[PDB]
Amino acid sequence: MREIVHIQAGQCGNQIGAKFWEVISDEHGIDPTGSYHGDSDLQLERINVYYNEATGNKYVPRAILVDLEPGTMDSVRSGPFGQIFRPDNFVFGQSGAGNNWAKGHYTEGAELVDSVLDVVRKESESCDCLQGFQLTHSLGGGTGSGMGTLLISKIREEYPDRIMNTFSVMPSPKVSDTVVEPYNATLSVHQLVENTDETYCIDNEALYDICFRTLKLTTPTYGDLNHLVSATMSGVTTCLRFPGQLNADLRKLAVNMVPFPRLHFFMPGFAPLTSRGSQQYRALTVPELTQQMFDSKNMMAACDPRHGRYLTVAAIFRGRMSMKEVDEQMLNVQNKNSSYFVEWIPNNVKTAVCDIPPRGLKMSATFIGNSTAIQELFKRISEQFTAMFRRKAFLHWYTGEGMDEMEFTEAESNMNDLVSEYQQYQDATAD
Template sequence: MREIVHMQVGQCGNQIGTKFWEVISDEHGIDPTGIYHGDSDLQLERINVYYNEATGGKYVPRAILIDLEPGTMDSVRAGSYGQLFRSDNFVFGQSGVGNCWAIGHYTEGAKLIDAVLDVVRKEAESCDCLQGFQLTHSLGGGTGGGMGTLLTSKICEEYPDRIISTFSVIPSPKVTDTVVEPYNAMLSFRYLSENTEQTHCIDNEALYDICFRTLKLTTPTYDDLNHLVSTTMSGITTCFRFPGQLNADLRKLSVNLVPFPSLHFLMPGFAPLTSRASQQYRALTIPELTQQIFDAKNMMVACDPRQGRYLTAAVIFRGRVSTREVDEQILNIQNKNCPYFSDWIQNNVMTSICDIPLRGLKISANFIGNNTAIKEVFKRISEQFTAMFRRRAFLHYYPYEGGMDEMEFIEAESAMNDLICQYTENWDASVDEEEEDTGSQNTTNVTGGNDDSSMTAGSSNSKYDYLQQGIRYAEQAVQDDKAYNYKAAAQYYMSAADSLMHA
């Protein structure tokens, strides 16, 4: 079988991960003790992807639970599915990190990482044909962000040919726990960009909006948010766990969704999302479901897909649905919304159908989109980061307590700016091709105006962004005479020069 090893790091990662195991255990007919009580052979056909069959017919999750303090582990053990997990796979410290990314990545996390990797090796060795790793964590926390990214880099070194897929909860200013979340998220994104093949972005702000506006919950709890996330994760992994027509493993999903290695930040979604009061009065049709799945209100990320373009997308339908009707509706959506789909990737919306429905629904659909609008989320985090970093607020916790260099903040900011520019350039590439297709032979923008409009938007914007950042750090260097500011200014000027050469 093509097995997947699941890892959950930090308090948020463990809460989401545990809820995910509850949902898929129910779908596969596995009770809280690991015994199968299902009624369909399809439940067992590919169960070895996520479960290992132990002695006595007990099914044990291929899961590793990690935290730097014991409290979360105690909560998981005390929960209804606490006895489902292998006791040796609980790996935890005693000190905690106090929401400091540097402690999770460089000090306390580094002390625990060898013990974690030993458990990872044992799980990997028990697989017949390991296809990859799945990680749930939060980017705003010290353990989830700091140790989670350390774990991805170590696994990338040890298993370079295996896929790493993450479900990463992105911090939001509207739903915040700690003031240093922008620092933690910015530092985490750099490692996710380098070491993972798929990052499913989940935004607390979007989850709260869904609970308030769509589900009509007046006081949503973290259990409500975790239920939304676990339902989405269950749908995305459906094609790994049950027989399907397309996207049968992590690598196929990557090939279909990721056109360039660094552009692997995906927007998940789910439909139908209706309040419990109105759910029993609605009989959903495929056209309604397809319309909902592309709606911004059904996305788990707080950005509007209409502000960008879909490079690629995948829609996974569950229940008794007609393949022909699905294909017709997807084609209809693309034809009606041509400006919102990339025109240089043909057949860029993939569909998959699983006959086994989600509990309580006759039909449902999960969505995974690679849309350039996700750069708005990155810009939001970057702006919050810059506002604090410019004043060096809360920075003393990181070098002194975490043992990291301030230069790492500058490199993380540079990596984020590069990522934003890449998404911008791929949005502009579509616009340029449209201009060429209409027969425009000149190099100026059709709207005319000032001289800047004659340049390619992506290269121009990135060049000026780099110059502005370089000037900012050069001015700071003149004031405080710090070496890292000189280095940062030089790095941005070099990036501007590279951008000019390739323009």
């Protein structure tokens, strides 16, 4: 088969990772015990991508759970699908990371990384034909952002021709008031820009704004933010998990979505997102879905596609619908927003349709955009970094682990360059 190895690191990584496994296990008909009980054969056609087949018709997530503190591990293990994960794939420490990137990347994490690599190797050696890895993590803390980007480097050295895919949750002060998050993020983007092949930018600021302004939720909980994350992760992996033509593996997706090696940061979006009161009086239609997944407020990255240009776009529709109508709607939206798509990449919007809808919806749509407007995300993190680095706040926290000051300067200059590149291709014309 064409197997993927999943890795989740840190608190955020293990929370969104666990929900991901819960949602796709439901979609593929796997019960918490690992037994199959679905009906449609499409559920098992590509089950091998994410699941090993053990004895007794059990399906085991090809997943590796990693953290620097025994917490979470237990919550995960004592959760809906905790008994489905392979006991040996839990690798945890004790010292914790204290939201310190250096503690994750250079010291305590380094102390644990070899134990993780043995499990990675053990899972990979049994893959009929491994295609790559996916990591879920946050960029704001210590374990996920620090030890996660370390795991990425170590795996990239032993499997240099495999795809490295991350779901990276971006820090926002509206959800986490931990002050050194801007620093951790900048150190992480510096790693991601150079060692991953494709990165879904899951923005906590955008998830917060969707809950507050669109779903009209007074106090958004992590459960709300994670339900949005899980719906998007279900969508963006639909083409990997069900029989299909377009973007059917990580490499074809990357070849279609990444026109230049550094510009591999994707802006996801989901539809439908409807306030509780309006759902009853809002029709669920193909024109509704197409219009809404191109809306700036529906992006899961806090940015305005109207402020930039789309390099590439992948759209995925799920459920029973008319292919003719989808074709007509997708062309309509490109025609009415042509100036927002770079003219030097012809036929840059690709569309897939999968017959199996997600849980609880007659139909849905998932948007994956490689737009230059994502520079806004990197500018926001850059602003918060320069207002905390001019006065050297907390620097000691990192120098106390051995880090020189220039590593902060390089991780910042590299991010300013990334912004300049997005702008360079944002202004390039064809004539």
